[PDB]
Symmetry: D2
Subunit: 402 residues, 4 copies
């Protein structure tokens, strides 16, 4: 009759590649399979035919990630054909949704042993073309699915607008009064902290390599590619806003478009013991929230509020906060709404998506796993991961180290 505790066990990720960069040759399905293969190699006591489900986040699903990439990935990874899979889409929150969905399946007693993760290959996102609506139609057109609006509904544009994600971040900067200077400082600190974590070997502990064929032999992609460790305030101040001279968001204070995949095991207490797993954290809960599309970046606020209210935990009780850095403007605006200092030590202690990049489907799984990793290294207890969502949402997920 009682709900069951749920533990995150092993977790692992590919490096994050730049658009057109180190991972651009790797099909989304094959990329998604890389962390799955590593889970298999890294957890040899598991009876693999007992995995109840693979849940994977993926925002696109038009490309080599089409037709339920979770199931494609598990087959490519060498998991038995008897294992089910399902793909979740809450845009940039998809991979976190995977984790929280997996958690709810175990908490409710419907499953014992599951994998949750996320993939996105933005390099390889395809073009789409709608069907002709009439014989001999002269209005055929291609649209890029890399990021952002396509097949725009005129009713959506008239009621809510179809602001680009950078536009929404400018709207957040405007409405919440987040200065260019503050955004650049945040971005700088993101780059510094990530450069420090990379030199410390922190990212290395999370990463499994991806092997790439060249003409004369193979290389290994080993390192997060997006980082700009040489970033300075002077460098950031010189950049032009994406949307015009009177705006504040720049490529230097924004996440990038990127490729990568991540996955982790979740299990009941019985499953941990049966499969020889090492339990690392208990999942406390997940909540979602909605906001106006035009200020989508503030979405984390109702999400975090809803979760912490229900669990009865103060925002200030968390020993780590992984706040997604879609843009410095909205990162800062969320922190301020929540009463957390712009530079508080527990937020993004190893940097975030400004430095690391953000393959939509992967980023939510990455935030959960890195929060856990951070809690282990620092000896912290509770961790909060939260991110915003295109078209105006937030997602939040809380964990507690065992």
């Amino acid at each position: 009759g009682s709900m069951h505790d749920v533990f995150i066990c092993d977790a692992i990720r590919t490096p994050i590649g730049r658009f057109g960069g180190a991972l651009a040759s790797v099909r989304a399905d094959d990329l998604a399979a890389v962390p799955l293969k590593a889970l298999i190699e890294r957890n040899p006591g598991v009876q693999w035919d007992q995995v109840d489900e693979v849940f994977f986040g993926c925002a696109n699903q038009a490309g080599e990630d089409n037709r339920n990439v979770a199931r494609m990935a598990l087959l490519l990874a060498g998991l038995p054909e008897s294992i089910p899979g399902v793909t979740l889409n809450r845009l940039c929150a998809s991979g976190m949704d995977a984790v929280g969905t997996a958690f709810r399946a175990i908490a409710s007693g419907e499953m014992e042993l599951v994998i949750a993760g996320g993939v996105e290959s933005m390099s390889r996102a395809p073009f789409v073309m709608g069907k002709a609506e009439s014989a001999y139609s002269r209005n055929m057109k291609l649209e890029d699915t890399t990021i952002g609006w396509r097949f725009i509904n005129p009713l959506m544009k008239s009621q809510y607008g179809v602001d680009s994600m950078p536009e929404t971040a400018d709207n957040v900067a405007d409405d919440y009064q987040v200065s260019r200077a503050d955004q650049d400082a945040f971005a700088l600190r993101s780059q510094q902290k990530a450069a420090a974590a990379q030199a410390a070997g922190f990212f290395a502990e999370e990463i499994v390599p991806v092997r790439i064929a060249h003409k004369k032999g193979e290389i290994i992609v080993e390192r997060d590619e997006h980082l700009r460790p040489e970033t300075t305030l002077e460098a950031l101040t010189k950049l032009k806003p994406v949307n015009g001279p009177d705006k504040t968001v720049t490529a230097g204070n924004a996440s990038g478009v990127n490729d990568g995949a991540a996955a982790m095991i979740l299990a009941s207490a019985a499953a941990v013991k049966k499969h020889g797993l090492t339990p690392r954290a208990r999942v406390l809960g997940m909540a979602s929230g909605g906001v106006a599309p035009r200020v989508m970046g503030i979405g984390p606020v109702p999400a975090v509020r809803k979760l912490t209210e229900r669990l009865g935990i103060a925002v200030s009780d968390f020993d780590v906060i992984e706040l997604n850095e879609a843009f410095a403007s909205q990162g800062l605006a969320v922190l301020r709404e929540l009463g957390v200092a712009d530079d508080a030590p527990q937020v993004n202690p190893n940097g975030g998506a400004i430095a690391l990049g953000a393959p939509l489907g992967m980023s939510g799984a990455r935030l959960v796993l890195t929060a856990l990793h951070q809690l282990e290294k620092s000896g912290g207890r509770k961790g909060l991961a939260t991110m915003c969502v295109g078209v105006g949402q937030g997602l939040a997920l809380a964990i507690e180290r065992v």
Copy 2:
């Protein structure tokens, strides 16, 4: 750790199912998904809508007007407040049932109180996709149709598991489980007959809200499911040529079609049922999934049903209705045979299924759940089972219980 919470399906509704290029072909998938959501608003005035915790929607494609989280797109279009979150699930033809069971788990685990679960597919409007060039001046650009089935084939997938088309997998099931053409056609006929009777009885009308269609001289309404072929005879079935060549058994007459449609339903905890003045119609009992060989995807319901009923301690024979998805007569028959249920068992698909009705991938699983409940209400039955197959070798099963 505290108690699990009971979960109730309340009001449910769907659009008609349209033929490919037929009655609903002009309707964008996001607008189509909004249709049942707007009806749920109209039909339950007691609900305080700003208390919906989540809209969960199934959708197999997501490359078209259904792109970038159709659940969230649809709820905004439906006029639900911007404060309501949405998320889209993809287990191919099982997506809409996955929405229901995922909703159920969210409430059962105490994370939510009031949710909407549904599904949509516009297979009419499924776009073409073109991979990016890998090199400057590449001579290798290609368009592929996303309406149904394989695209961007992985060599590794093809080598190991094959990339059989869905009709091909149904031929494989026919061969491996020895389901004869004759038996397939008889199954298909009963589906047409039963659906025709249900339509005439007004049974589908109780499930349906109309879709409005733009027209010169004034918009029209679509009220009735379009796929049905009520005049079908064994003789016409017998004369059809198989999809995959002259030695095979699967034909367009004994297969589900490619179709458009949307459906949605409310799930609520007991406290939400009370607070919003909803009618609890059934309790959700549970959901299970299972995997099989891609090449025989149609048998996927078997592991799913066994997993579910074993954990719940319910025998297959205990269910008052079984809504078994009719992707193909071959797999429909092979599943029943494995589960020890007669090919023409009165509790199985009493109002016909996807052969007559059609099967918009995302919507189908949601239809199966709501129609099962509907049938329990008409018949006074207690427990129902809804189950379906999934391309690339899966099955999904969900059990409910009236009142």
Copy 3:
């Protein structure tokens, strides 16, 4: 230097965009007139055809890779017969006749076929190759009619006005009023309707068989047109403008072909010489006023031949747009309603498949000379991006 005679000539009907001929591949459509010439001319020894010259404005679709050659093979002409495709946009089919004429007049050939084709219904989309790996800048463009792959240097120096925009520019610069344009358009409809009922087009037309459905009537005509109806239409380019769908040609499908021959070949192949070709000339104008292009072309030709415009017993002036048709007539000193101009109507009523239209003008001008007993005839037309072409014949 050799006299050159036009002999037998025929055409398909002209279909509307997406209408009666929309299912017919351009190459098969081109072959239809060629087959009819074979059937209609049994004295001809077909392995002696020196060349098939065909006009075609597009060449991206089933009309790709030298449609002249594709068509003659599809029409059952021996593989020994060569073909060549010419492209001067809407004047392409006239260019074909004029080029055939030059080949025979200079003594390099004796017996040739000249024609044109366009399937505008079937015109494909085009997409540039990616210029970088993982390019996000892929785009489809319609080739049915008008600008695609615009060159920024063309735009900045000459502009890339659409054809209707240039027709507005002519109406403005040459002061051609809306009411005059609509009047001319109505006369075009009325004359074509009269010609249709009299069997005039039927004498030019060979049917297209579609595997069976038979297309045998020009489809674009709107005999129902009234001045009042024309007055109510809205200008394509805004209320301050003049050109409308009703006083403009349409987008259309069709093919035409004719035999040209030296005196020797006429006699050898038992042909009926119907007209002598007198000459062809071209000219260039500013692209933004492309519709006035006929004027330099006609002046150049008539001056060289030593003929006045007023000497022609028929003038077949392409009707891309009423504004330019009228502008041209005015410039050349011919009345807006002169009886020898377009006596059976023109492109506003009949439609204008680009590559076919010039060959149609030449064959119909000849046909009208026969009907009327006239002597000299002039066919002339405008060309996108600023040209004109003119061709003179004399009934034998």
Copy 4:
């Protein structure tokens, strides 16, 4: 009554490799390069007197769409009063432009004209047919770089739709042209071309192409001067182990443009031009598509018979090298030795490349160039055409 016609100044771009030196240059802009050079090179011309620009172009789906002759003259800075027309006989297109230009002046309908050709095969677009029905599931992209697209079932069933290399394999088979002879032919092409490049022979024909942020392209890119018979021997046939045509014994896929002035004697005098050759004539011939490479044979026969000139009277023969197989077969049918010194003395398309629309204009101008250098009188340029044709053009140095 017929008027004599003279070829005067002539110039070309270098020939670039597919995806190589000129891949960024739009076909219309590329066409404009020789035209602008003709202006620079001929100061006595009153440019508004040019009666017509005739240009060959095989594709016309890309930036070469909608009458590239006229686009090119405008981009070159020529007055807008000058008309233009584009000709398509596939690889023979640029030769057709010259021949057509010739008939225009000879017939007295013009006095001063430009003839040339262009092809950017690098930038050839993809094409997509329109949907035939609402919600059509049958939409498809095809490459227009070279060869069959939108295949007609009736063409395929009667005549076949063999690729260009397949037709060249068919000629090898039907006319018994061995792999070894083909390779030896190819090696001589490369060798002759490397010698001519070193002698500055191509330099004299070339105007550079300038590509901003800036690179000057001034040399033919396709040449393989290190080619040995041993290297060619190692190559695998395009169409499988039992065929004979290889990448090494075939022309390539390429970009480039060329143009030249043609004039009556009156126009020569008025415009202070140098008359370099009189044009004698052009003839065309058809063959079976499946052996398109043999097309030059009927073309050359029809031309020489009409002019009363034996093939052996020619001081230079510029035979297009689409493939060594068909080049050799053409030479043998015409009674000329596989290595005759008057044939392709500076090499040809195997070394140089073949941008379809340009190649025929190149053969005519280079033929004239060679006559000037060697002191010869009569020249013959000839080439094959996809779907089974040949074209031939004869000239005589003044």
